[PDB]
Scaffold this active site. Sequence first.
Site, short mmCIF file in Angstrom:
data_model
loop_
_atom_site.label_atom_id
_atom_site.label_comp_id
_atom_site.label_asym_id
_atom_site.label_seq_id
_atom_site.Cartn_x
_atom_site.Cartn_y
_atom_site.Cartn_z
N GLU A 136 51.21 41.76 44.79
CA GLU A 136 50.13 40.96 45.36
C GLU A 136 50.39 39.47 45.18
OE1 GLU A 136 47.75 42.98 47.12
OE2 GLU A 136 47.89 40.98 48.03
N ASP A 137 51.62 39.06 45.51
CA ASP A 137 52.02 37.66 45.57
C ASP A 137 52.12 37.04 44.17
OD1 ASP A 137 52.53 35.31 47.54
OD2 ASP A 137 50.99 34.49 46.20
N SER A 138 52.46 37.84 43.17
CA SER A 138 52.77 37.35 41.84
C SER A 138 54.28 37.26 41.65
CB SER A 138 52.17 38.27 40.76
OG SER A 138 50.76 38.27 40.81
#
Lengths: 48, 357, 223, 43, 242, 302, 80, 44
Positions: free
Chosen positions: F54-56
């Site tokens: 999730e875009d980490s």
Amino acid sequence: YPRFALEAQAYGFICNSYIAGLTSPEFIFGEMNGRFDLINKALSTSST
Amino acid sequence: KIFQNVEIKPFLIDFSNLFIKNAAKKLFQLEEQLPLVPVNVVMDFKGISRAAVHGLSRVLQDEIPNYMLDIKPGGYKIEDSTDLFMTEQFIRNRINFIPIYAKNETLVFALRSLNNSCEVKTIYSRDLIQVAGPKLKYPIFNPTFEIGFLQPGKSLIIEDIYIKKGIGRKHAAFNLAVKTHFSHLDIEQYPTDKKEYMALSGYKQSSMTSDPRHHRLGLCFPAVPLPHINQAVRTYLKNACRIIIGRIQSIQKIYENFEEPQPELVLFSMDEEKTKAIITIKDETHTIGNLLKTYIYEMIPDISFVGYQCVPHKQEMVLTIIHKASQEDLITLLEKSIQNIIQTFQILEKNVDELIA
Amino acid sequence: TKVLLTEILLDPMYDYAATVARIDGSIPMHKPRTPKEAEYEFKTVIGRTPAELLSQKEFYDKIYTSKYRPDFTQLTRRDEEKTSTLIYLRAYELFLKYLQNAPNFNSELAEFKTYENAYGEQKALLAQQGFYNIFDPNTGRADQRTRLFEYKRLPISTLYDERGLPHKWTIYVYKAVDSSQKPAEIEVTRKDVIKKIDNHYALADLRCSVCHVLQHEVGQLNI
Amino acid sequence: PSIMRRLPRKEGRIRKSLLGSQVWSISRSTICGNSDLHLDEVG
Amino acid sequence: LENPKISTFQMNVSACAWYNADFDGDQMNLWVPWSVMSRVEAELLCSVRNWFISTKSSGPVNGQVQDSTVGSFLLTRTNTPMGKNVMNKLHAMGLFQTTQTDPPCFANYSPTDLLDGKSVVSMLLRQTPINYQRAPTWYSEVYAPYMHYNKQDISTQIRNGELIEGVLDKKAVGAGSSGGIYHLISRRYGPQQALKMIFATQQLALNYVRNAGFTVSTADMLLTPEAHQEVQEIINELLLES
Amino acid sequence: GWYCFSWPYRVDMNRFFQFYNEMPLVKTIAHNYVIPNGLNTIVAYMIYGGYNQEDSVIVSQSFIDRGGFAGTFYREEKVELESDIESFGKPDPLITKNLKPGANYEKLVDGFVPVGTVVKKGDIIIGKVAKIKYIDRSVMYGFDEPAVVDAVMRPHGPNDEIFGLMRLRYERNLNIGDKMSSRSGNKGIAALALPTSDMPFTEDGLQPDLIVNPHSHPSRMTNGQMIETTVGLANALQGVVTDGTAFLPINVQLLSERLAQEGLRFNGCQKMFNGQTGEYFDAAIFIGPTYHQRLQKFVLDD
Amino acid sequence: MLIPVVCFTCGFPIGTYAAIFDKARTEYIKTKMGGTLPQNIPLDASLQIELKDLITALGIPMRVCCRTHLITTLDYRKYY
Amino acid sequence: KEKENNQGLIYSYFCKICGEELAHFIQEDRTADVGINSKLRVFI
Ligand SMILES: [Zn+2]
Ligand SMILES: [Zn+2]
């Protein structure tokens, strides 16, 4: 593009892919559609 | 003979290149090799599990005690350091990461740079004057580092530069070995130049099935004196072994006290004569847990379960062992596995002493 | 005295004159720790005591003037570091002249600006990481080969058959990888691919569901 | 400034002090990913 | 979090579906109830298990997102580019060392015995046996002519928790998948039990990738020179008709 | 980045000076006129434990300790006086009124905290009392993270009066929650910090500085970031810096073949091992230098 | 503000060969520069400046990260 | 100031004998600053 152009490229037909790269007119047309996503995303908060 | 066929090669400056020759000779008046050079050591291991080899590598990387140069609080003299750009954070970050090969924790250095010229003057590492401790018969760091630079009419005075000890896991300035090679010599490999195989790792056996026991590990050490390379590298290897043994021996003191209520060992008697052992140790890494799991699994092929879960946000290793024996038999098997680990690393010690002359 | 010291100590002119005084040793390299050292630094840099600065009327007439007066006429193009020193010293001298409204100032300013532009060209030469161009082996310069789309008027036989109807490429023709497999070819629709085609077959070519011609054999039609 | 100007808009009395609220015993921070936490757990 | 250097609110990625959140820089509030009355009602009414099933679309909210959707596919995939998708006893136990559930029994296995991903998934779904039979997102008749689908991967069937065949992907384990695996568990065993299986099945998917690997590169996007000529020949037909 | 070349002469509010900056291995024409801001972080495009979902991103702890995206963050305190009413000085408990609870007045020296000392939460950095016996309008340091008094001065304002100016400096490293971004607009939040022995490594010893999810690409179609990694991977071994300005002629097929000419694979992927276990992946992982930049959104301020 | 003492990625002692690598590089550029203004070097479109052999002669290994950080790191002295 | 702070920001005083909260102080009210016709002012 000239006035009353008949070719499909003059009206937003992007013949290239991202992996091959776009030309200047194709990038401008892509930015025209890309800007709508940013505008509608902003409206999707206030208008909703 | 677990550990055989080690080869050691230093990283030296090629003075056949005219550009490098001229630059070094006009900068540092350097015409021969530096006192401290990096050393690449390639080691071949046979008849040993990859868990042990990888644990040795991890310990040599960032779990072995190591020395750096640090500034005591108040060492950065604000009263005299007039430079506006060489802040304390920047300079101390530069100093901490200089690779050193120290003899004792007593040496104390000082950096006193005065800029009487009209041009920016570069502060190198040769400008570190030893002010406390016995006089050095051999340098502990290279004199070619760039500590900083001073604007015209500025100064930088730093005192109480001492040698600090720590492990590389807590802070990266204590890291010792940098990885350069790791492979399994008992597994065949595809030619990955072909477009049919370039999407795969290359090995002809999946990691879900393979159990290699013949490895090649190559590590590079950043600072080793020229005339004692074989004396230094060997020491490093030996050091690593002791560390692992020491840590393992800690667990060996837990199983010995299974009768008394001990916080780090929990024993349950499950159904169908099954027993469960949970070992929770704080500030442990995947090295000890992986070694324990591998050797318990080797000792008990038909074990019900074993796992070494090391949790990042809990800073602890929890080893769960479920086996269909009694508590006493399980503890006996665990002690046997620990003894196997100890004897394996003792054999590694002996082979390290035997190989590097 | 306190207000005068607070005003002047915060003037960048004072700091620059103090740096010039520090270079040749007129004042200690360390900033003052006691009021006496501050007073001495003020006297050396400004040239007048704070008490006597309030009595008389000038301010810029007696600000430090560097001790070594190098020859700046070699700024007319162990030489390069000396050139840097000359640049710094002439910059200070010209700034001090600007503060004092010295006669014959604009021409010397322009001359030193040209000199410093040449020095900046040299410094920019010292500040290059390098550059590389992937040369086309067929040519001897920057690669022009691209995978961009190139327009080409295809023959009309690709869109219409010999009876004028459009092509509908909707029959998948699969041929056996090995010779022993039979039948040699299978023609299926997209719905029947999963039910009749295995890994023993490979997609050879498409077929039109109107004129029954292979796509690769479309050029055999009379245009 | 008037008494009735305090009512109407978003920063008015009704929508900022009555329908909304400033509260104590509350915290705010950037969120982060953690695959070792349960779906009903927060780090 | 006992680490003094952590200043963020960490949560499972599968919990983002409740808040429509992501980790590009979002900030979220958090207040801990202190009153007994408010603390009781937080546990009984406002618990996140009460909104596993959406009150909007009457379907599940949570599931696998972006690594356990492709991770479950690889785990349940029948064939691997390196042969059959099997694993030894040692690596089968390593998939259950993080799920935080009770470990299964591997006593009836030699160290050289091989276990496939379906068996490993089955040992976790035995706790909440359900019945599921649909076609996975992996199968698509759009891709069918140009692909050789495996006949054991296009039919996901689970009876009494035993994954008989097929792969697990967005259709079965994906977030917001109505009639999915976690929707059936919630209906038969409770929304809290479904949340534990989402976490439990998330760990097998992630633990499988710990040594199976997954990556994207530039060559994954590059057409072959022969296929590039086929693409522009198609585009030239469009410009010919235009 | 280097937000200003004359930063030490300035007392600015909420300014970050990143120590280390690098010219991109694939530079553009925009870098002929402005200084590049960022580092050529080695980035692995892989799934590693699910901490980059999730875009980490997953950040090497060693990269943080060595100064990666590290710098100093500045704040200013500008306090003014009322002419002849208030003054700068240390209050005394037995005369001055309503002193702030849980304060620390002992660090003041002649009304101001001396330069170089560490001021933490609750400390009084500026002493100020108004003569009525006295009322204490002091200024207290209300921040959780401790600062260091960097510069103290007493200038004269436009009204010819003394006001207090203090500069507080913060030693900022890259920590969990800081936002980073590539040059293709793929921003991300630092999620996990692994030691140098837990990060994955190649057969040749190369290990990533950042681990980004491969699922960040397909929906956002940031192909320029993937091409940059492919071009930049060959530039490092060849020891060159090339130009990747937009609308310049490129051929990804030819750039991929350039990797093989340098001894790498056609696709740029390499054999990698799991640092925690020592087990190799059953897939070659695409790892290479991608220019990443730290966005000035600090979790220590939000 | 200078070339780092150690490589940011792995920690190889890059700094001890940093200064030399700077100065030597300059002469190499002076060899390949060619009738062109310095500030226009990154726009020449005809340069082939390769630093592989220089770094190899410095003794630095063929690691991607180390050579990347050695080559690409900006120097504060050269801009201020 | 024996204890500079317990990492928790407090706005209230406590009794040194038992620990009971005496009172609280956040900010000075400063509303009596306006104490008690431009004509008489302009005249003065
Ligand atoms: Zn037809
Ligand atoms: Zn490196």
